[PDB]
């Protein structure tokens, strides 16, 4: 819809700082700092690698629009989530304890709050029995 | 009572679809069933044993049809474990998988046969024995090992074929006149194949001194080079097992996966797929238009984490330590 | 004179129970004895050689009974080496072990037979040859290797069975009319099994051009895939030997064991199992109610040391160096 | 007996410092310091891991009582001692020299005094010939 | 239109000369063609099938001649891909390569034969099957593996030959009197060779008790030691595959090659082979008689870079990490 | 002219005693010579070919005697290369070596025979073929590999022997009544040995349905477990080759050897074995009763260097890097 | 020709500084410094190793004359260039992109200017289509 | 002879400093320092290990007398010298160049003077052709 396109254009303009028609490394760094997390040069390089595809050293608007258009169904990442959980699935049966996820997820990677891992469990564990199934989570939303 | 429903469906899907441990027990039993029928089928081709063997085979085939139909229906139901094959549409899609199609085809063919037909019975037996794979794992593993050792296998095949041709020709020259075994070069080639393979039927063998001397000198090379492909393949299989064991011991991908799941949840919450997802937004605002920027940065974080996890998703034995020490030394 | 008593009991228990080096010599001799009897037993089933073979076999079986009875009694006595099998109660418990029960059963059966019975004699011979293990080490090792290479073995078995079935069927079609060897599909399957196994009796072999061409094309694959399981198992055995050798070279568990024994003695002295143990208490007091606190802390030290030793009790080749370098790098 | 239970309760109270009904990490550290050896955070973590089983971060009284009740016969550690000695049994015959034990045991791990390794030998080597047998030691007391 | 010309020539040279992937498909087809002819040739030696087989074989041989001539001409043309075989002189030099000479010789011989000759036809078939290598890769690989395991192979050969001699002699002694199979020691040696190789024709086998006992005791050792060379060679082939795979994963020679090419261009520009090359001279002058000194220093830089690249051109598995850690430790 | 004398003696000793490269060529030729005689000897046991074969064999045996005598004398002379076998006393001691004694014994026996004797001729042929080793290298290597894989070999032997016994007994029960092949249990055991070894003479084979079914089920296990020892030994040989290659690549003992030779010369010069050795004494005095103290300290330096070199004289693959990194980390 | 010999003698004299009839390590270092690049002791050792063959520790005139006489045809380095390109030939088909060479060659080893890698491509890529062939380059000049 | 015994006793007394009937670690260190080379604690430990056999921590007189009695013929070190030379025998034929020995022996281990490696060659190379044979050297003196 046109409203979504206008919102994406506004977001790109907000990311844009010097008005060169593109989002540069410094703009990514300053938005990262504003979000609260201090960025790194390698982090911004990965930023550009994910976004940039033409190899220009910056980020353009059509690429951002196309990527935002790509929702979960175009990510083909079901196998990636399955592998991640299998790595988490120590026993391999297909059951993950809620407590282990709460303790590790809040102490590994981009750690979140306790309520956010409660939301983890609620979204993944449909029955809310505290036993998360990997396949159900990977297919329920992404697929 | 949907908790027990889901648990039972999970167990059944694990047993029927890719099994890991004791589930194979069930499959073994099923295989035995099929195997038994096959054996009885063979006993039905002998006139003396036709009566008893066919009497038992009818009952055993009815039992096999019942078991396979129950298994097919239970598999169709248990496919609901995966949300991909959910609902009637998902179950039908699962039933559309080519190997499930072959399963239902075999079931219907057996039902029709049991309702001259022994030929189709044998065909169904062999086909349902092929069905035992359902994934091509055996074929894929064999192909990978053969490709890995393709050059060595080609060396063995080339030298062994040359040895067969040369030994057959020389023994033919030695034995053509005074041995009815080697009447034509085709007989010599048959003898060479049956000798170098070490089968040694004994229908043909050299009986002259020239023939026996040449056979002695060339058989030693030929038998070794004909046994070489089996040895190469067996050693390759064992070495593949070893490397797979080491790699499994070196999965070492917990942290990238944890970051992946973290950023995946962040992307799910940031996106407008649901409206109730607002606590993560409050967490982002407390940790500091703005919402769209947060969504974009979060999805890009998800993408970078995905790529980082994928790059580390190939843990190997020696390259791992080599690269780790290179990083440590350049740090120094 | 209990020092020599204990030394002799230790030596006898080492020789009879798990032997390591030259003790096996004795076992070999015993095996030879049994083996000899078995061979003579076979010579007793031939009418021509019955007289002399049975004359020698009677004496040899009496000798075997005497040797096995002496060995059983000496083993029961030497079990006193281990304090678990101490006293009459401990010795009886040792005699209650299932393999010792089988030993005494074999002894009593042989005594009864020597006091139509040749059938039971053969049974006792085979049973006392099975007795050679007494631990299942051969079976456990075979099972471990088979399980490790289960997938490759299943691949080989599947493809080889398909090759057997296909070759047998095609050669049957080629040879059914004009070869009395292949009169029924059972004959074709027998020929295929005896060919792909490379046994090649020669009772059946293709004699048509279709049959020989099909046999030539399919035998090359079939013989290789029938020899594959043996090659896989042999390579797996050799690789297991290699990894075991490396791990043995990398026991590297002296210090955790030393700490374990230290804290074990500390726990023994702190506990009130004995009253004379007071010097360690004086050492603790000089290195500073209090006694119970010291006991508790000491037993907890023993537990932590036990867990630390157990964690390090699995030294491997590549994971060891990988983890050590990871620790070094995170230290850096 | 009731006397042993009372003694264990007194020991737990002595370990208890703030009177929270449990033995915390700091109490373990201070008792370690009182004993003479300076503790470490990892050492106290192993403390809790050995004692704690419910995963609460502290130590409770019933667990201590049960553990103190467990004498050598419930430790199932005979194989552990056998393996430790086999590691010490360089030749593998089953004989260990007294001098080597005296020199190493006092210079490895929680080293003790010379008289304490003399007691080692006396307890293990029943005949007192200076040649320690591993199996006799592992089975004489623990079994 | 020379761009498409060069692309087509490159593709054709890759397919005909050293192929890597799907190019082999073509070769396979060609091989099949030749193979078919060979098979038909065999069917032409049988009187019953002479008519049809020769009728098809004439056409198939004409097709093979056409295909091989086209391939030879296309290979001669595609050799222009490499500037070494450029122009008429370069193409003639390529045609002078010994294997191309053999190719044209085979083509001319087949043309002459197709224009008693079945003997030369068989000779050409075997020769053009040998032609399949064109590089000796199979022979070189076999020689390398045999040399690597020369000592183990010699052990196996020595012990197996001793076992053959001893078993043959003892079974001859056992069977000389009462078995027409073993009439002379030559018969005993023939039986021993056909037994220990496991071929087992059945024309000779022991029939006495002495002979069968001796055969039983010695065959177990002999068959194993005769199968040993094949197992050794197969395991060596598999291990060579493993080490080659690891080394390929550890090429790790990008930077020395980059420096090599840099200094190679520098040497090319500095040298007076061309007159237009002056921009590099300006770069050298801006980064500071003089020209000859610059040329000399540049060529010496090229030489040092060449030697450095060559020294690193042998990347191995364990020596690499050992040397890297030694360098790191001496740095520390 | 003693320089060329010593060079020639060195070359001859290298060729005759332990050879490394092209020296083996000579040995091969010699072996061929002996081999030829052996073959001709076999042809002399056949009445038809006695005349020509013996006519050639006489000349070939005279040639072999001449060659072996010349080789023995040249070896005795070339032993002077080593100062241990110097002078007449040293040469006689070399001639006293047991294998040289066997060599001269074989030479004298052949001379006597050539001066019914065909039996001693065959004995000399086999003995001089055994002579090919002269060191036991083949036997030592086989023993080392067998000992390394002793447990796996015992597993294979045990399970295969059980399979043989069980299959033989069951097929005997199946075939005793209606198959003259299995008349006694000895016949069944002979069939089982000839089947599981895969030799398959065909003199005995099951012909009933029970017998063929039991043979089919048990042969699959038996043939694999009978081929297992050969596969285990071959894989062990290949793995030993691999580890030896790596260790050779990791000799890495230059510096300890250099220190060893340095201190060895120092000990030689310090000691009073010679009087002219005084320059090293002057070097010691310039680098500062005293002479005896210098001698003592120097010999102790030699001893410490000897022990250090010996300790490092066992360079291995993984323990080397493990210990080196442990030293580096404890340095850190 | 005599002119080339005279020019080589003049070059050797220019390299010669102390007039000892040879080029020493210090002369190599000072000429390296004059060229602009700072030399290293190992670099001068490799210098001598490439030039020196008699093992005297310095560089003589006849060796320099002979080496300068050796043109590309005597280098037998065709296989070395082939291997270097194959290392550069990631796909192995025999095609190398111009952009990758421009970006790497100027950021690896003795890096040069952009125009110098343009000359790389021009000399190697005869057709000037931007797709460099390894065999054509290795054989066109060196062979 | 008695004269040699008296000389050995005098040498032991000279090594003896505190007159305890034994040569201690400090005496070994001070004699090492007097010789010119600075000793190390590990070096003196190896000293004692070579000399001491009873495990007393010092060196006694009878052991020194016995060791001095042991001449080359009792060293059984022929194989050690053979292995050392084989390590030096890069080609393995059995010939070692004089120049390589001169350059390495004076730059490896307990380096000596040029004349001392000339003596190396003279003693080993009997013919004095500059080509040292390993077996001749190992057997000429030690054997
Ligand atoms: C050595 C030899 C013979 N050859 C090669 C060959 C055969 C026919 C030709 F016409 C030409 C070359 C051969 C041998 C074996 C054991 C097999 N089976 C196998 O590898 O199973 C994995 C095959 C597939 C080919
Ligand atoms: C390949 C092939 C045939 N098969 C597989 C097979 C057999 C019967 C079926 F009915 C179905 C599949 C096979 C082959 C061998 C050598 C053995 N023996 C063995 O592995 O010893 C370790 C076995 C146990 C099975
Ligand atoms: C073991 C045994 C017999 N021998 C040794 C031998 C033979 C003849 C002699 F006169 C003397 C010694 C033997 C055995 C095999 C399988 C082969 N073939 C082979 O290795 O293929 C790679 C050869 C080349 C020799
Ligand atoms: C049957 C069989 C194998 N053999 C004997 C054997 C070996 C090789 C041959 F070639 C012939 C016969 C065997 C079996 C076992 C279990 C053991 N272990 C044992 O008894 O120690 C307790 C031993 C020591 C030998
Ligand atoms: C499996 C099986 C049979 N056995 C074991 C066996 C034999 C006789 C017994 F009386 C008892 C046990 C067996 C098999 C082979 C191939 C060999 N040969 C060999 O290993 O060469 C290296 C031997 C030495 C024994």
Residue numbers in the entry:
A (entry chain H), D (entry chain E), G (entry chain F), H (entry chain C): 6 to 148
B (entry chain G), C (entry chain D), E (entry chain A), F (entry chain B): 70 to 184, 195 to 367, 535 to 578
Pull verbatim passages from the article behind this deposition.
Each KCNQ2 subunit contains six transmembrane segments (S1–S6): S1–S4 form the voltage-sensing domain (VSD) and the S5–S6 constitute the pore domain (PD). Here we report cryo-electron microscopy (cryo-EM) structures of human KCNQ2-CaM in complex with three activators, namely the antiepileptic drug cannabidiol (CBD), the lipid phosphatidylinositol 4,5-bisphosphate (PIP2), and HN37 (pynegabine), an antiepileptic drug in the clinical trial, in an either closed or open conformation.
In the map of KCNQ2-CaMHN37-PIP2(-), no PIP2 molecule was assigned, and consequently, the KCNQ2-CaMHN37-PIP2(-) structure is in a closed state with two HN37 bound, similar to the KCNQ2-CaMHN37 structure. However, we could not rule out the possibility that the two-HN37-bound KCNQ structures (KCNQ2-CaMHN37 and KCNQ2-CaMHN37-PIP2(-)) may present an in vivo transient state after which HN37B will be replaced by PIP2 easily. aThe subscripted (-) after PIP2 in all structures indicates that PIP2 was added into the samples but not resolved in the structures. bThe orders of the ligands in the subscripts of all structures reflect sequences of these ligands added into the protein samples.
